[PDB]
Design a protein around this ligand. Structure first.
Ligand SMILES: Nc1ncnc2c1ncn2[C@@H]1O[C@H](COP(=O)(O)OP(=O)(O)O)[C@@H](O)[C@H]1O
Ligand SMILES: Nc1ncnc2c1ncn2[C@@H]1O[C@H](COP(=O)(O)OP(=O)(O)O)[C@@H](O)[C@H]1O
Ligand SMILES: Nc1ncnc2c1ncn2[C@@H]1O[C@H](COP(=O)(O)OP(=O)(O)O)[C@@H](O)[C@H]1O
Ligand SMILES: Nc1ncnc2c1ncn2[C@@H]1O[C@H](COP(=O)(O)OP(=O)(O)O)[C@@H](O)[C@H]1O
Ligand SMILES: Nc1ncnc2c1ncn2[C@@H]1O[C@H](COP(=O)(O)OP(=O)(O)O)[C@@H](O)[C@H]1O
Ligand code: BEF
Ligand code: BEF
Ligand code: BEF
Ligand SMILES: [Mg+2]
Ligand SMILES: [Mg+2]
Ligand SMILES: [Mg+2]
Ligand SMILES: [Mg+2]
Lengths: 304, 322, 322, 322, 314, 308
């Protein structure tokens, strides 16, 4: 399923980008370099803290694959009816065997696969076990499928399934050039007075934010001027025939009115300033804690 | 009847995964027991008469990734008998005691096709010590497996029941009884690791000698066979990364042939793989820094208290797979 | 009606597994009770008149592998009755209260063909104390089994209901009441173990004496009858293995006959078993080192807190199987 | 219509199990209530006019094996009323509300054949407090039983609904309401146990006195009536064990009569029971070591926390059966 | 037709409004929903419409079905006592026409009151139920109980239940007056003893019934009906248990008396002639005997969930 | 299962709520009035949650928005979706969004978004994952078709609303319990034309005397009060003639023409039902407690503070 999403669209971490461009494109663009002992990779576990653009990179592989893409997830495989949560898995791999090449993206694999020391009999042993046997097994033939998977708790994963995912890549909190790129992307084609040093300023300002947070500070900063439109007392003419904008109570030509009072078009909507983005970044707060990072770095140093 | 055979028609595998006994490295005890329980009754059936009966159950256990399912593939190639690779997806159903008729129907199918082998992979997910489990799935699937394996009116002649597991201590004691040769598949030793490198490089052109493979096998203590399969995978994927990572190729030698070389060399043109014509590429060579590169990057899987409980079970109930 | 009898027609077993009362070792008490509840009413029916009625339920329990199902096969050979052999696979159905007209027409089959025996193998999987179980399976199959065994209008004359279990403490107290002689089948003792070696070697040519079997029986304390059946299996598969480790055979003595011998001996030709002609092989007999070899390799099944709960139940509700 | 009466024609029992009110031991109060609810309306129907109506529901509960179903057989002999004995096998049909159409037809038959008795044995398997049960079986069979017992247009004149149970606390409170005399059948006391030994030995020749039965009744505290029926069963087998273990018999005294005696005695011939002619055997009379032998071997069936929940229910909702 | 017209009863169980003890709010609502539209039909014109649904709930045994019998006697209606046995069927598309037929014959027989007793057995939240029985019945019933303006004669839908919290919220909506029938207090209990002894000869006074009504707190009306049943049995215990009777006073009449008394012959009831028995009087020790033996029925946490539902919806 | 209508409810028909109203005007009406304001990456709200105690007619307000946005009102009850329809609920949530797309400008109203969206940790498979998984996919429908549709959710218990669903409702607006003027209007509307002798001041009194009541509450009290004269006529002993030939009404023991009798004694029609009074409602106010707990103010205002 290919809507836009591209390798051009993503910001930072070219190790992930090159591992994947390798593991999907390098067989598909060339299916004749992989003969003999040289086989492509058949499982990749991405992880990291939330917000860091995992599933977006997955759908970049969906568009940028020329491959089928099944974005099932752990919400859709839980059941409660005695061995229904397994036939879903098996028929998923049946449509992936019948349709080579394929990609299976199991989002939040930590909700299926929970270290089996405290879990219940059926769901633990039977969903984990059918995932194991189905990934390599005996009569199963994992040719041409790639099993992705993302997680935030990579240390709560069963060691047999840590074994099956043969390239555990770590997606970290991003740097400076990526943040500047994300502001430049998310403002889109909206008229703004900002320069390169303005986006550079904001990217310097936001250390610690993931890509979600910058998408919502651009959302809020794009909704500042409309907010000063419609909750406005007092506008004022400036300058092609009449044009009024919101201004404080008592100013040079400050009439008292509401946006409703003002004629079609002849509104002078407030511009997009860097104080709008600084306003939004002051108000919007991220998720993370700096001990979660210690256990992530633990797992990366032990297995990743 | 035929609804159930319509379900279990997709278990008689029909493709013979070409793994031979030579490919499976180490473990001569487990191959020995499996040969004298699978190969030898068919090849010399006159011997097994009187009190001398063949074995009818073998449990393989061990840490994750050491050879269990793979050795089952070796049996599936070399056996010449009907092989059912059943699993938990194919035995549980929703309708109140229609799971049991799939178990009973599986062995009642297997005695139509005698000699047969039934390979229940990860038997610890069916058979969970029955002190905390639920009524139906627990007592009725475990109980029908028990009664069906030896029972009264049941006749386990000519069927063999394999089975692999990673948690052999969470197994019910009646089913520990039914599996009459619990063999233990351990982490490989030095000669096995050297054998696995020599196998996994295949017929790929390499400058390595016997002392090189001997060196790597000395280097990798603690790795299972999966890990050595992926360090050979990564070390084989180094040269392609030396074609993509090439600001510069060079002609050598049937009409034009260029390979990656360092910046500034004898005939070093500056280009990318994309610039170079179909076929007329001459890929790199394998030297021990490729394997050292891969072994630095790839990190193991297992953990050294899991081995204590495995050795516990082997010392209390188990064979030794050598 | 007849749909259900068409289902349960395949439970009245008819092949008569040829185990006779000799072939069980130990357990004089359990054979004694089973004879005076099965054999004796048929052979002398004039006795059982007045207040003297035969027994109508016997529960055998014990650790895994000690003789329960085997003793049921002995009854199935020696009884001269219509031995049914039913289980939980054959009573539970899919369509809403079919899983108890099966129970009812099972016992009505045994009443039409009296004197009958009903052998419910592993009864703790049908009958689970009904405080946590589900409505249909639990209350309705357990309840129809209760009412059908003694009830009001039901007449359990001339039917006998056996039953074996490994978890006798998880049994409902009404069904503990219905089984009126709970006999306990324990792990073996010295004379029984010696008897089991003498039985399981069969008619195989061996150099062993009575003091040799006596020696092995002294050696194996802690083993159940399964374990001794598999050490006899392995020890009978030792000389075939020495045929396999025999670079060198030798003629001895009806036209040519060769056996494995050490390198360099009186008539020691160098060959493999493959080289040697059909029949004209001379199989080596059995050393006591073969059995000591097998007993070193094979390891028992039971543990020693399972025995505490077995002895608990025997001291609170049970008999002693001797 | 007639399909359904063809199903329920096999419930009108027609054989009158010959248990009389003296074959019940103990239980003054329960016999008293059952007589004045069953016997007395038929024998003197002129009395029950005006405000004085007969009882229309009686629940018997207790520990397992104490007299409930047996007292129901006594009613079935002495009542002179049609005695329907229905159960959960005969009400749960396959077919969308037959399990309500069957119930309604049941009481319609028991109104066209009044005076009638309906004995629902083990009512706790139909009626399970409806907080966890399934929609159909739960709400629709329980609900049709409720509405059918008293309801609006229903007229429970002249029908009586008995019912026995072992788990009286797992009963729905609307159905606890419908059963308007919950009587409790307890474990027997001293005089009852002595009475049960005197009954169960029957007319068998024994040397026992009143102080012997008194001794045994003093010995057996904790036993229900089932257990004493089986210690009398086992103790009545003890002369056969003598008369088989008898190397040596001897004539005593209508033409020849021989009994087992010790080796070397007055007229001690050496033989086996097999050697001795039809009838002309003399079997040692029941002498008190036979009963002491049986009482040593046979062990109680009911534990002592089940009694705490029985006494709980009796103290919260119940009568006392004395 | 001829399969649901076994919902009409015709025997008229003779319970009148002066036999239910207490419950005056419930009689008030039932009178102004049943009696008053028929007796003064000119009043209900314009915005003033009669009530079209009444749910009675409570603990088990407190008066719900009995009060429905009182309506069935006093209403002068046509009365359908339908239930889940009479609506569900094997054939699909029969548990549509059966409900539909029911309300159409209710409009054949206006005025109609329909008593769907124990509605929680038809209407079970439809998340686990089977296809045929649960869904098409409950949807068709919701539709046909959405006849607000058209049902100005005819259907008044009663309904009783013991588990009012297991009822679907759309059907909690349709029943527009959920009335709660509780365990009875002092004057009601005294009234029930005075009713249930009937015209039986007793030596009791008003302070005796007052005493018993003070004694029985916690009992529902069923329990007092059975202590009066048992206490009325107590004379026949004092006739069966007899060694000695005696003549008193229309030609010969003998009653049980103690061993050795004025005219105390020794005999058994069996010895005595038809009729000429003098049935002993009813004391207060008979009732104290019965109240000692009989033990209450409702448990005091069932009342907590009843009070829960009353405080949330009732 | 899905209602549709082009409703005709003006802002003025909705008692009070002026603050919500003004929020909705700029959240919904401004985009619709001046669409040219929303070119490029500036996009109108497309999820709004309405939250507050029951009995505020969140539904009615929702129809006013539709009327004022000149849009079709499509609506669904989540309780019905979860219980009544179950099996076909996925289909229903689909069709609902599909109708709304086909009918821009339009508004989807989901009532009781709390009875649908319950955090998905312990819910059953079909209703839980399938209904709560379809709504979310559909509300991502702003993008495939961001323009022309708006989802308004309604909840009484916002604290029990699935955080995933919660997050799809950018804008959140608290619908508070009413006010003196509004309660006064509600009394008038609820009696409408009914014959009674209430003054303008009585209505205000009734208003003042029902602080903390909802429209619903007031509706039940009024329904109760109007029946009082019928209640009096139906049950009384002493009656009395007043005034087309004989007409008697209940009066106290001992009054001007007070005969002693029962309603049963009195002839068809000629029975005088009591006139309506302001005082009588006061009775009805005592016998109907308000529905809504007082800690809701804060719980709703916590939401106005946090997600307003
Ligand atoms: N590192 C990033 N680079 C580019 N876009 C990002 C990044 N992180 C988040 N985003 C944007 O935020 C949106 C949500 O990211 P998502 O991948 O769903 O988060 P998560 O990885 O936590 O599941 C995506 O559509 C993505 O485009
Ligand atoms: N002893 C071995 N010899 C050859 N290959 C092995 C060995 N052990 C593991 N492998 C490799 O491991 C994979 C098989 O997985 P397996 O060892 O069966 O896992 P498990 O034993 O936990 O089921 C194959 O890639 C195989 O190449
Ligand atoms: N008492 C015994 N005498 C002889 N063989 C025995 C005895 N008990 C066990 N065995 C051996 O045990 C084997 C397996 O035991 P089995 O019949 O399964 O016992 P059970 O069903 O109780 O577990 C039998 O086939 C027999 O070979
Ligand atoms: N009270 C008793 N008096 C006489 N025999 C009794 C008594 N209780 C039990 N028995 C004997 O024990 C058996 C068990 O009685 P039964 O009716 O089955 O008990 P229940 O149904 O309660 O479990 C009866 O058949 C009878 O043989
Ligand atoms: N108010 C009452 N007046 C008279 N008898 C009553 C009353 N309530 C209960 N009873 C007695 O209890 C019996 C049971 O009433 P019933 O209709 O079964 O109650 P419900 O249906 O609530 O459980 C009544 O028939 C009568 O015997
Ligand atoms: F004792 Be066996 F396992 F039946
Ligand atoms: F009926 Be019994 F008490 F098991
Ligand atoms: F209140 Be009753 F038990 F119907
Ligand atoms: Mg494997
Ligand atoms: Mg067995
Ligand atoms: Mg019984
Ligand atoms: Mg009732």
């Amino acid at each position: 399923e290919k809507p836009n999403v591209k390798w051009e669209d993503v910001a930072g971490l070219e190790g992930a980008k090159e591992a994947l461009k390798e593991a999907v494109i390098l067989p598909v663009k060339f299916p004749h370099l992989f003969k003999g002992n040289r086989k492509p990779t058949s499982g990749i576990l991405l992880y990291g803290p939330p917000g860091t653009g995992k599933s977006y990179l997955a759908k970049a592989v969906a568009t940028e694959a020329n491959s089928t893409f099944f974005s099932v997830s752990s919400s859709d495989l839980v059941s409660k009816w005695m061995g229904e949560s397994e036939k879903l898995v098996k028929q998923l791999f049946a449509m992936a065997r019948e349709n080579k090449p394929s990609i299976i993206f199991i989002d939040e694999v930590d909700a299926l696969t929970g270290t089996r020391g405290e879990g219940e009999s059926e769901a633990s042993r039977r969903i984990k076990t059918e995932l194991l046997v189905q990934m390599n097994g005996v009569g199963n033939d994992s040719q041409g499928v790639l099993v992705l998977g993302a997680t935030n708790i990579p240390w709560q994963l069963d060691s047999a399934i840590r074994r099956r995912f043969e390239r555990r890549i770590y997606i970290p909190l991003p740097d400076l050039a990526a943040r500047t790129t994300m502001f430049e992307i998310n403002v889109g084609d909206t008229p703004c007075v900002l320069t390169k040093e303005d986006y550079r300023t904001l990217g310097a300002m936001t250390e610690g934010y993931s890509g979600s947070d910058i998408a919502v500070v651009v959302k809020d900063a794009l909704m500042q001027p409309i907010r000063k439109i419609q909750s406005a007392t007092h506008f004022k003419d400036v300058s092609e025939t009449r044009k009024l904008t919101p201004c404080s109570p008592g100013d040079d030509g400050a009439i008292e009115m509401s946006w409703t009072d003002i004629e079609a078009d002849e509104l002078k909507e407030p511009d997009l300033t860097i104080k709008d983005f600084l306003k939004a970044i002051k108000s919007t707060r991220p998720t993370v804690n700096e001990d979660d990072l210690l256990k992530q770095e633990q797992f990366t140093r032990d297995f990743g």
